[PDB]
Symmetry: C3
Subunit: 150 residues, 3 copies
């Protein structure tokens, strides 16, 4: 300690992060369940198309997961916490729909993949705008002071 804490600046981000982990846990338990239904034992990640879709829906979500966390936290700190958290929920809800769709059909992964991309791209844009607002003033000022010499 510290007679102050900054938890109240990031608790929405932390809540959306936790929801994210729970969703990834669900995807994982669904793969375990597909291994049982389709008798596909580790090591070994191939089997019927219907087992491969569930496996692949989960692996896809897992590989985008750190991009989402990174971008969430940077947008939430540098741009606005509520906005970032809100895009976060939208991304996670689109990922649930991606996973459920892909499991039924490769073609049904597409509409929600696109919803999830719009939401991550918006987080990236908010992260860039916040970082630009952080760095640009001081860089322009320094450039200008440099020219000031009559």
């Amino acid at each position: 300690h510290h007679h102050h804490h900054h938890k109240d600046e990031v608790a929405l981000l932390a809540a959306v992060t936790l929801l994210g982990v729970l969703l990834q846990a669900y995807f994982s338990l669904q793969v375990i369940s597909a291994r049982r239904a389709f008798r596909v034992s580790p090591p070994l990640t191939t089997g019927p198309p219907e087992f491969e879709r569930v496996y692949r829906a989960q692996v896809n979500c897992s590989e985008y997961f750190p991009l989402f966390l990174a971008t969430l936290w940077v947008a939430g700190i540098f741009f606005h916490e509520g906005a970032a958290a809100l895009c976060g929920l939208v991304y996670l809800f689109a990922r649930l729909r991606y996973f459920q769709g892909y499991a039924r059909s490769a073609q049904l992964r597409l509409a929600p993949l696109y919803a999830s991309a719009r939401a991550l791209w918006l987080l990236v844009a908010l992260a860039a705008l916040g970082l630009l607002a952080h760095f640009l003033p001081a860089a322009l000022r320094a450039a200008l002071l440099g020219r000031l010499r009559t």
Copy 2:
């Protein structure tokens, strides 16, 4: 700067995080070593069951790795740093045992997969309790003030 820092609030979490990275590095060097022993060259992630087990033990640890980091940090900030760090070590030690076991035998991955799940689930529960202690008082208060109007 800053005439204060908050490093002393997260240095255990940071130490367990670093240990985590070193463990994932080890798993990776062990896959490189299995590629050599079994003459399985990239691209290409199939070969003898014994090469596939090492590959798969590493990929499994890598896909749960961000869930562990996310949950560690949220539990450590919102619930209690020492507790979270301690569950963290237990999870990582169980992941070493998972990797070593899975390499010998698919069946030997199971006991430590279950130890690692208990430890991650405890981190998730501590993260949820901390977030609940953060949000519930103010939400109940607002609900109640709403009713106060005689």
Copy 3:
């Protein structure tokens, strides 16, 4: 709020993190593009060696991505922000070269894999040194006070 913020302690780390996410996004759009060129539809991650190389270059970068983020942030907080950010850029530029090389040829992945390992290992070493500078003084002091009793 808070009448102070600690954004100015981590904005380089946040910028390098954002650049990292954009690079991983690029790798992903390149896999989508290889699926089109080589007519390899999900689920399903095998096809011509040239499709498998692009797929695998991306999956490899994605699995090291959280190790990089973890290590970046710990080195940047506990050791020195500019140094960590700089090793960060070097790692990311080596990852671009890895991806481009691996896509052309499995053998062309090697020189930049090694550049990217040197840069991550340096981040790990800076993270360890910072954590050692944080923990060692107080541990040695406590050990010594323990002996002090005549």
